[PDB]
Design an enzyme around this catalytic site. Structure first.
Site, mmCIF file in Angstrom:
data_model
loop_
_atom_site.group_PDB
_atom_site.id
_atom_site.type_symbol
_atom_site.label_atom_id
_atom_site.label_comp_id
_atom_site.label_asym_id
_atom_site.label_seq_id
_atom_site.Cartn_x
_atom_site.Cartn_y
_atom_site.Cartn_z
ATOM 1 N N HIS A 30 0.749 -1.044 -0.023
ATOM 2 C CA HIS A 30 0.076 0.127 0.080
ATOM 3 C C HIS A 30 0.762 1.047 -0.095
ATOM 4 O O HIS A 30 0.582 2.306 -0.453
ATOM 5 C CB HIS A 30 -1.022 0.018 1.227
ATOM 6 N N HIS A 42 5.335 6.932 6.650
ATOM 7 C CA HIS A 42 5.148 6.484 5.380
ATOM 8 C C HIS A 42 4.553 7.859 4.620
ATOM 9 O O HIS A 42 4.427 8.695 5.189
ATOM 10 C CB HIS A 42 4.231 5.363 5.296
ATOM 11 N N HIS A 80 1.792 9.149 1.098
ATOM 12 C CA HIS A 80 0.814 8.770 0.105
ATOM 13 C C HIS A 80 1.227 9.809 -0.966
ATOM 14 O O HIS A 80 1.486 10.936 -0.728
ATOM 15 C CB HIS A 80 -0.551 9.271 0.989
ATOM 16 N N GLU A 105 -3.693 13.257 0.823
ATOM 17 C CA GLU A 105 -4.901 13.130 1.627
ATOM 18 C C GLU A 105 -5.445 14.087 2.205
ATOM 19 O O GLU A 105 -6.697 14.616 1.882
ATOM 20 C CB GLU A 105 -4.614 11.894 2.740
ATOM 21 N N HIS A 112 3.342 10.855 6.780
ATOM 22 C CA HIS A 112 2.467 10.867 7.783
ATOM 23 C C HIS A 112 3.602 10.056 9.066
ATOM 24 O O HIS A 112 4.089 9.035 8.660
ATOM 25 C CB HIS A 112 1.405 9.880 7.630
ATOM 26 N N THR A 153 -6.316 6.547 7.938
ATOM 27 C CA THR A 153 -7.007 6.765 6.676
ATOM 28 C C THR A 153 -6.706 5.510 5.736
ATOM 29 O O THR A 153 -7.172 5.687 4.489
ATOM 30 C CB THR A 153 -6.186 8.008 5.648
ATOM 31 N N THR A 154 -6.087 4.415 6.379
ATOM 32 C CA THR A 154 -6.247 3.159 5.730
ATOM 33 C C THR A 154 -7.228 2.093 6.566
ATOM 34 O O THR A 154 -7.280 2.387 7.888
ATOM 35 C CB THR A 154 -4.861 2.360 5.477
HETATM 36 C C1 LIG Z 1 1.308 -0.051 10.681
HETATM 37 C C2 LIG Z 1 0.636 0.513 11.403
HETATM 38 C C3 LIG Z 1 1.870 0.842 12.817
HETATM 39 C C4 LIG Z 1 0.182 1.957 11.340
HETATM 40 O O1 LIG Z 1 0.849 3.030 11.201
HETATM 41 N N1 LIG Z 1 -1.024 1.914 10.544
HETATM 42 C C5 LIG Z 1 -1.476 3.051 9.872
HETATM 43 N N2 LIG Z 1 -2.472 2.774 9.162
HETATM 44 N N3 LIG Z 1 -2.886 4.046 8.348
HETATM 45 C C6 LIG Z 1 -2.057 5.186 9.006
HETATM 46 S S1 LIG Z 1 -2.207 6.617 8.319
HETATM 47 N N4 LIG Z 1 -2.349 6.896 6.873
HETATM 48 O O2 LIG Z 1 -3.558 7.286 9.042
HETATM 49 O O3 LIG Z 1 -1.017 7.471 9.164
HETATM 50 S S2 LIG Z 1 -0.695 4.544 9.965
HETATM 51 ZN ZN LIG Z 2 -0.784 7.598 5.891
#
Ligand SMILES: CC(C)C(=O)Nc1nnc(S(N)(=O)=O)s1
Ligand SMILES: [Zn+2]
Ligand SMILES: CC(C)C(=O)Nc1nnc(S(N)(=O)=O)s1
Length: 257
Positions: free
Chosen positions: A61, A91, A93, A103, A116, A195-196
């Site tokens: 993703h 990470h 987007h 986003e 993020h 957001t995922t």
């Molecule tokens: C893998 C885990 C530690 C994590 O961070 N999961 C998230 N899933 N969506 C996120 S977000 N785009 O809202 O920052 S972070």
């Molecule tokens: Zn994110």
């Protein structure tokens, strides 16, 4: 399984994750004229000097740069937050074109990408417990626009060739995330969600007003990543963003006038 394609993208997520239509979903459009300055908001405290990066992972993703979060090494405090939030990973987007990819939007403007930096509230002990709490996470969101290169991003860009496909990881030690920040820590904040999927409503969003600049070459390299695993038909990892969701009964607060 969920993704960003026509048949499994954001418009479909609600079937497996009904909270997708919830009361505090993210991202949102930040209407800068309607956000209100909150003079009681404190400056953000970003303490990344002891951050310990470990690994970079293509999860199908996005790519995650993961940190050692077993101690208070890289923490976010202050701002709208009570207590201490530990950096677990960052990470991005991004879009297929420079005109989209973020986003959050600002007065409907889309940036080329959005970073993020994900942090969890240490009072809940572990990320998995934190995501079950309304104040479990603090995500620091930083917009990327295309212009000059961001020197502190280049080490990320240069490892992406080694994690082209879903499930590949590479050692990624000694990366300093301070090199990804803009000069100003002025921010907007509101209560939202991941957001995922699973889209849990556990995030205090802190979105910086100042975007960082990255070069066209840097974002082009993001777009060479693949959603697919090795040996599968190539699907470029682009447009891995969820669009803005209804603000509903929320107020966005600004740290700055
Ligand atoms: C893998 C885990 C530690 C994590 O961070 N999961 C998230 N899933 N969506 C996120 S977000 N785009 O809202 O920052 S972070
Ligand atoms: Zn994110
Ligand atoms: C929200 C949910 C699907 C999730 O991602 N839960 C996690 N629990 N620990 C993680 S880790 N390996 O980044 O620390 S992710």
């Amino acid at each position: 399984h969920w993704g960003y394609g026509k048949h499994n993208g954001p418009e479909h997520w609600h079937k497996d994750f009904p909270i997708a239509k919830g009361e505090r979903q993210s991202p949102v459009d930040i209407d800068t004229h309607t956000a209100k300055y909150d003079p009681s908001l404190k400056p953000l405290s970003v303490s990344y000097d002891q951050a310990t990066s470990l690994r970079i992972l293509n999860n199908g993703h996005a790519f995650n740069v993961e940190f050692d979060d077993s101690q208070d090494k890289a923490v976010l405090k202050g701002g709208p937050l009570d207590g201490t939030y530990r950096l677990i990973q960052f990470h991005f987007h991004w879009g297929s074109l420079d005109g989209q990819g973020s986003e959050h939007t600002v007065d409907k403007k889309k940036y080329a990408a959005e970073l993020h930096l994900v942090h969890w509230n240490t009072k809940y002990g572990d990320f998995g417990k934190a995501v079950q709490q309304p104040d479990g996470l603090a995500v620091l969101g930083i917009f990327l626009k295309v212009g000059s290169a961001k020197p502190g991003l280049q080490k990320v860009v240069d490892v992406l060739d080694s994690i082209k496909t879903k499930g590949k990881s590479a050692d990624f030690t000694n990366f300093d995330p301070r090199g990804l920040l803009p000069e100003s820590l002025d921010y907007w904040t509101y209560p939202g969600s991941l957001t995922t999927p699973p889209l849990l409503e556990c995030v205090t969003w802190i979105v910086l007003k100042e975007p960082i600049s990255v070069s066209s070459e840097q974002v082009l390299k993001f777009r060479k990543l693949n959603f697919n695993g090795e040996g599968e038909p190539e699907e470029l990892m682009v447009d891995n963003w969820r669009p803005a969701q209804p603000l509903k009964n929320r107020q966005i607060k600004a740290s700055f006038k």
